[PDB]
Amino acid sequence: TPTTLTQYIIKSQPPHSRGDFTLLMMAIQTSVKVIEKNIRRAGMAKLDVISNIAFKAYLLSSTSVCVLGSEEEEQMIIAESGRRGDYLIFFDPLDGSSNIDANVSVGSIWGVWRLPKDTTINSVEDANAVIRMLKGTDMVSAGYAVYGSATNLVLTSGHGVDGFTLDPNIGEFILTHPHISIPKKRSIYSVNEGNYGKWEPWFKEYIDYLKMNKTTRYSARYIGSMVGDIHRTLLYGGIFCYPKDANQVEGKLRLLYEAAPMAMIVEQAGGKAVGSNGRILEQSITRLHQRTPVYFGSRQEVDLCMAFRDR
Amino acid sequence: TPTTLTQYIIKSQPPHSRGDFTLLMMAIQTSVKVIEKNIRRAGMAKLDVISNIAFKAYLLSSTSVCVLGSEEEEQMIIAESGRRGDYLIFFDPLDGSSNIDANVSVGSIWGVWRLPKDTTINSVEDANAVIRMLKGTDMVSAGYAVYGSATNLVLTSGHGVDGFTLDPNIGEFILTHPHISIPKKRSIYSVNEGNYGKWEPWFKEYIDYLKMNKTTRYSARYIGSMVGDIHRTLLYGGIFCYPKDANQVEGKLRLLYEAAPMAMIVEQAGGKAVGSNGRILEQSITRLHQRTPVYFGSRQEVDLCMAFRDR
Amino acid sequence: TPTTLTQYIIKSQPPHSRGDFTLLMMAIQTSVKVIEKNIRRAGMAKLDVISNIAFKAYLLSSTSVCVLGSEEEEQMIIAESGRRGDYLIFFDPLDGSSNIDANVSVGSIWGVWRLPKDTTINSVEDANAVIRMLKGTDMVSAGYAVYGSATNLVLTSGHGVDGFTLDPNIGEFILTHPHISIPKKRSIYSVNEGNYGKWEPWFKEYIDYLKMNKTTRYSARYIGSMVGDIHRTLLYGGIFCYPKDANQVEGKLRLLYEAAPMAMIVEQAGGKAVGSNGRILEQSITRLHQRTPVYFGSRQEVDLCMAFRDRNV
Amino acid sequence: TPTTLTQYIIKSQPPHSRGDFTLLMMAIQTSVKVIEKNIRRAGMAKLDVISNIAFKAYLLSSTSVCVLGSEEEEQMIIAESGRRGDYLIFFDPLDGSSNIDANVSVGSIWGVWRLPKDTTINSVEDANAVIRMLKGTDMVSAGYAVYGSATNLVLTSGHGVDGFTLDPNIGEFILTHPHISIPKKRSIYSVNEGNYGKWEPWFKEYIDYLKMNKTTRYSARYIGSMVGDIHRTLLYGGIFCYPKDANQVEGKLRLLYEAAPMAMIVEQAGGKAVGSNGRILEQSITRLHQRTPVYFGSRQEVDLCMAFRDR
């Protein structure tokens, strides 16, 4: 009898709780397994469509969600009244989708908020007003899935980070990395140096230092799948960067769908997650599709990076 | 997006229900998948022990059960107060276990009752008093799993019978036979004719008639796994019998763990399920391990069988 | 590192052999796995068609076969000259196919013969003449697959019987039952007693004796899948019967596709396999689709059965 | 009926051939599947040991190999006389093994030579003399496996490159990428820029040019698994580099076990594969563990790289 994700979730709630969160996590597990099946058999943008359809179908039928936000879509979806729960969920169903052809890691990301007290959502207008009142610091849960040689699911509910691995023989996520802690330092950096010429001078200096300083040798790793690179960062330590550049002034990653959920996971594991001006989680949501640069990882590595920006 | 068992259960409950039954059925699905894994790899009893351990671990951690009864054990188990639900569940974790060596069907069976109103169970004594007040007609749910070349799960909640099949690629039970209806007649009988000499004379006459009547030709099938034989009976029609014998005066099958759950499924599919004196479901529970003979299946086939007894 | 079926076959041939048999067994393993995949996902006669297609496609491309005979087809198939080997293979791609709906055992069966020396086959006429010269005693290999909760492959090449189990994690058959020996006696019988009224009197007497004798209690098991019932018989012991009955004027099982391959397996495991007049393997093949009754299993159980037939003379 | 790797191999040999190569490829397929099983369940250097054991056991029992060379071992292994074939096989059983912990791509690589005519090998001394007479241009076959979200097997026998994917439902490699052709140009480069300060000046200039030239924008990808990075390079195009270090010692792959097999694949797909002085495949083998830098990929990308080296 191994410890399943479902068991872990049930145990970690107060005795005789409402159970909305359990149903939500059932729906997410199912979605992840359906996406994994499709990825395994790829050889024999279609994957994007399927992944989106799956997440929406299972989440809407869970009875747990009020509002759904998929990164691929322009508007939020409001659940129908009869099966309307109290969670707002924003997800990237399949990050790094081009990578499938070369058999490299891809991933899914989600962040979960709760309806503020004395608030209802009967339309997209209501939902738009509600998200403007929220911040990453109000997020009750976040997680991601990594589809590689194993399928991992990493999750937080505000009390640290736990990693699960899909046992394909029983179709259940099993606990394999309890209490993930990102090391305070580690000499690995992860960025696309192809964009060097577009970067801000302070960040060029930081990267040049990593390569040319006399004291500490650094290794570079850039898979080109944000989930894969962050997952490695969490377990090994290091830094992952999507810096500001001249062709993408507001940054690369979407706040709601990618950067804020990942920031919550990284902070809960003991790392740092910053944007252009402090913590990602402290930024206001003005826009459903707003963006930010990111500097994530081991807390002393992010401090060294910010020291070049400062001054 | 296929229809999962979990989705079916959630949809079939009132909007915003308590959700105890969903958690129970999650625990049962997980147990069935764990048992299937072990059966698939047999060779490369022990299976009885593992199967019992699995059912108990997942059911007790579901938060849905007050009291657990395993066929293999002398006493019922009371769930601890912090995670105590309102279902009484009696299960046979692995019927036909010897059959594994020859790669023939095996199965699991369960029946679920609810705490009567104004009743509590804080001990085995309480639980013993409670089951004496219950009958099969008070049973809220029943089901079985068949472990063969496919893994099937057949289930009722009082509104007919539905069959699911395990999709090993996603580890979910998928709906495959909605609204199972047992034919009113079919010329198949299922009994161990090796025990011929120990049977009551009326049942010898019935069996002799099936073989020697001039009007209707009958086929015999006896797998020797009760779940496998009942599963065939449900889908094809026919009759399944464990008649009274001179060496086993009170019958072979245990009422709570096997006969009553199977009787509820057979009745809900439109068949008949009788013992020595009428419906199995109408018998009083006096004893935890009490037994009964059974005559199950197509309603006209069971009527013909009872006509020999009545003469 | 577990012992695969392929490894077992390679090891059991003379050093630096031709290797036709290895390629044949690869093709059969592949066919079995493809059929298993389809059976596992049934629900979510189509199975018959797929199974037949699979066996033919993989066997013909193996380069090992001269002639193919599928139970479902009226004629044999001759491999094209460029990829023509020296094995004649007769197979039942999917026995008990109706059973799939109720999730009971199904199976595949095959028997392999070799071209007699100084013989060629360039047509169906040639192939028809060749099979008339052969008997079950000339069969070089036989096996079956059982598709249940596990997938088993049981095989003989004339030196006993070995059982393999499919490891779904690596897609290989692994050795699990080396040197299968059927017990000399065991009180289990397997027959469809629904057909009682159509049986010969001596066989009714035999069945009545199993039920009513004062000395030995017998259990009845009849799955209704020949491969499943035979597989149980091999491992537990007992008897399996498809006796002669008034409806069937020559018996139920086809000699080439089912009865002779199963007979070779049962004999190689230490049992007996008889028809209406002695060993199944000693019967002449007059007809591609000829049939026979069968009495298979533990040697003392088959002797008791034949004793009832002998006393009725 | 899909086209299996085994079928493809049999069809691609002359009618009624000896069949040694088929048995060899069976043994390799089995080894790859065994390694995949172990990788899938990681979590739930041990992998290195298991992988080595698997390759050796299955290859030695194939009857197809005369001599075995594993990258991990100091000496070659001679097959015992009774089961001695005519292939010399040099393999890296598991490249990138550390990566398993972070769920990133790993791989296996092999290259196959044939006994020269009128030559025998009854000892390690004989085998040592034989390899000194060979070059990469005499190699009869090469391939690799990539263990990611799918399991790929890419193979050449001197007539182009074909890619297969493992169907986990039937345990067979299925043809999915026939006739792989690497594009003549593509703006992707793959190197570890953490080693910048140890590189030769010409290669620093080349890398600086890729980042800062006014004409062509380049993307960087470095998974940190040689097989993963080469696999992407083959399918998408680009360049993969393990440059020579200024110290002339570091920045080298092993010729026999990694560089020459990968060079044969890249050339057969229409790319270029060069070392310090021309084609990898034209280098003489002076010893078993000899090394070389590599510049592999799209033919115009490798030409641009060599132009910086030339002046």
Write out the DSSP string of D235-279: HH--EEEEPPBTTSSSS-EEIIIIIHHHHHHHHHTT-EEE-SSSB
Task: Give the SS3 label for residue C119.
Answer: coil
The answer to whether B226 is a known ligand-binding residue is: yes
**Gap between the Cα atoms of C67 and D17, Å rounded:** 20
Alpha-helical (H) ranges within B17-156 are: 20-40, 46-61, 124-132
Q: Does C187 touch chain D (CB under 8 A)?
A: no
Contact B63, A16 (CB under 8 A): yes
**Gap between the Cα atoms of B97 and D191, Å rounded:** 58
Nearest chain B CA: its distance from C219 CA (Å):
5
Strand locations in B135-230 (E): 141-147, 151-156, 161-167, 172-177, 188-190, 219-220
- In a 13 Å sphere around the CA of B23, the CA atoms on its Cβ side amount to 29
Task: Give the SS3 label for residue A22.
Answer: helix
Contact C90, C257 (CB under 8 A): yes
Contact B234, B182 (CB under 8 A): yes
Contact A66, A87 (CB under 8 A): yes
Sheet with A188-190: strands ordered across: A219-220, A188-190, A239-242, A294-297, A272-274
Task: Give the SS3 label for residue A92.
Answer: strand
Nearest chain C CA: its distance from D93 CA (Å):
15
Alpha-helical (H) ranges within chain D are: 5-11, 20-40, 46-61, 124-132, 201-212, 226-236, 260-268, 299-310
φ, ψ of residue B126 in degrees (nearest 5):
-55, -50
**Gap between the Cα atoms of D15 and D10, Å rounded:** 9
φ, ψ of residue C268 in degrees (nearest 5):
-65, -25
Angle CA C99–C105–C110, to nearest 5 = 100
The answer to whether D94 is a known ligand-binding residue is: yes
CA distances, C207 to each of A117, C218, C256, D28 (Å): 78, 10, 28, 54
Instruction: Write the class of the CATH domain D180-311.
Output: alpha beta
**Gap between the Cα atoms of B288 and B301, Å rounded:** 30
What region does B43 belong to: left with phi over 0, alpha with psi -120 to 50, or beta?
Answer: left
Burial class of residue A123, CB neighbours in 10 A (0-12, 13-18, 19+): exposed
Contact D238, D301 (CB under 8 A): yes
Q: Compute the count of residue pairs across chains A and B with CB atoms less than 8 Å apart.
A: 72
Contact C207, C193 (CB under 8 A): yes
Q: Does A21 touch chain B (CB under 8 A)?
A: no
- Quick check: B105 and C40 CB within 8 A? no
CA distances, C251 to each of C73, C199, C258, C290, D230 (Å): 19, 11, 12, 9, 63
CATH of domain C180-313: 3.40.190.80
The answer to whether D306 is a known ligand-binding residue is: no
Residue D144's nearest CA partner among D31, D295, D48 is D31
Task: Give the SS3 label for residue A115.
Answer: coil
Contact A160, A180 (CB under 8 A): yes
Neighbours of chain A (3+ CB pairs under 8 A): B, D
The answer to whether A242 is a known ligand-binding residue is: yes
CA distances, C215 to each of C91, C212, D287 (Å): 41, 9, 79
Please report residues of B whose CB lies closer than 8 A to that of A172: 30, 33, 171
The answer to whether B46 is a known ligand-binding residue is: no
Tokens of C178: 């080396």
Q: What is the DSSP letter of D196?
A: G
Tokens of A138: 């109000």
Of A39, A106, A232, the CB nearest to D102: A232
Of A37, A40, A170, the CB nearest to B33: A170
Contact B111, B134 (CB under 8 A): no
Q: How many CB atoms lie within 10 A of CB C71?
A: 18
**Gap between the Cα atoms of C259 and C257, Å rounded:** 7
The answer to whether A247 is a known ligand-binding residue is: no
- Quick check: A149 and D100 CB within 8 A? yes
What region does D98 belong to: left with phi over 0, alpha with psi -120 to 50, or beta?
Answer: alpha
Q: Are strands A141-147 and C161-167 parallel, antiparallel or unpaired?
A: unpaired
**Gap between the Cα atoms of B84 and A238, Å rounded:** 45
Alpha-helical (H) ranges within chain A are: 5-11, 20-40, 46-61, 124-132, 201-212, 226-236, 260-268, 299-309
Contact D197, A212 (CB under 8 A): yes
CA distances, A140 to each of A11, A157, A215, C163, C213 (Å): 17, 6, 41, 55, 74
Q: How was this structure determined?
A: X-ray
- Quick check: D222 and A222 CB within 8 A? yes
**Gap between the Cα atoms of C88 and C121, Å rounded:** 10
Tokens of B217: 């030709």
- Whose structure tokens read 């009857």? D63
Residue D288's nearest CA partner among D249, D244, D253, D255 is D255
In a mutational test of the B interface, the residue from C1, C33, C44 whose CB has the highest number of chain B CBs within 10 Å is: C44
Sheet with A87-95: strands ordered across: A77-78, A65-70, A87-95, A106-114, A141-147, A151-156, A161-167, A172-177
Contact D275, D292 (CB under 8 A): yes
Of B41, B149, B192, the CB nearest to C103: B149
Residue D42's nearest CA partner among D100, D129, D93, D94 is D100
**Gap between the Cα atoms of A4 and B33, Å rounded:** 12
The answer to whether A148 is a known ligand-binding residue is: no
How far does CA B100 lie from the centroid of its chain?
19
- Quick check: C39 and B149 CB within 8 A? yes
Q: How many CB atoms lie within 10 A of CB D240?
A: 28
**Gap between the Cα atoms of D34 and D17, Å rounded:** 28
Give the bridge partners for C254, in sequence order. C291
In a mutational test of the C interface, the residue from B41, B51, B170, B193 whose CB has the highest number of chain C CBs within 10 Å is: B193
Tokens of D308: 């910086």
Tokens of A8: 């872990």
Contact C161, C262 (CB under 8 A): no
Contact B226, B95 (CB under 8 A): yes
Burial class of residue B290, CB neighbours in 10 A (0-12, 13-18, 19+): middle
**Gap between the Cα atoms of A296 and A238, Å rounded:** 8
Sheet with B87-95: strands ordered across: B77-78, B65-70, B87-95, B106-114, B141-147, B151-156, B161-167, B172-177
- Quick check: A15 and B172 CB within 8 A? no
Tokens of C212: 């009513």
- Quick check: B171 and A83 CB within 8 A? no
Domain extents in chain B: 1-179, 180-311
- Quick check: D168 and C170 CB within 8 A? no
**Gap between the Cα atoms of D259 and D295, Å rounded:** 10
Angle CA A170–A176–A181, to nearest 5 = 155
Contact D239, D299 (CB under 8 A): no
- Quick check: B26 and A23 CB within 8 A? no
Q: Does B44 touch chain A (CB under 8 A)?
A: no
Strand locations in D21-171 (E): 65-70, 77-78, 87-95, 106-114, 141-147, 151-156, 161-167
Angle CA C32–C36–C38, to nearest 5 = 120
Tokens of A27: 């729906």
Q: What is the dihedral of CA C194, C199, C202, C205, to 10 degrees?
A: 20
- Tell the CATH superfamily of the D1-179 domain: Fructose-1,6-Bisphosphatase, subunit A, domain 1 (3.30.540.10)
Q: What is the DSSP letter of B255?
A: I
Contact A220, D194 (CB under 8 A): yes
- Quick check: A196 and D217 CB within 8 A? no
Q: What is the DSSP letter of C288?
A: T
Q: Which run of H or E residues covers position B305?
A: helix B299-310
**End-to-end Cα separation, chain A, in angstroms:** 56
Give the bridge partners for D163, in sequence order. D154, D177
Q: Does A152 touch chain D (CB under 8 A)?
A: yes
**Gap between the Cα atoms of B164 and B175, Å rounded:** 4
Residue D230's nearest CA partner among D137, D104, D146 is D146
Of D16, D62, D63, the CB nearest to C16: D63
Q: Does A303 touch chain D (CB under 8 A)?
A: no
- Quick check: B58 and A1 CB within 8 A? yes
Nearest CA in chain A to B170: A33
Residue C276's nearest CA partner among C196, C171, C202 is C202
φ, ψ of residue A5 in degrees (nearest 5):
-55, -45
Contact B73, B254 (CB under 8 A): no
Alpha-helical (H) ranges within D82-155 are: 124-132
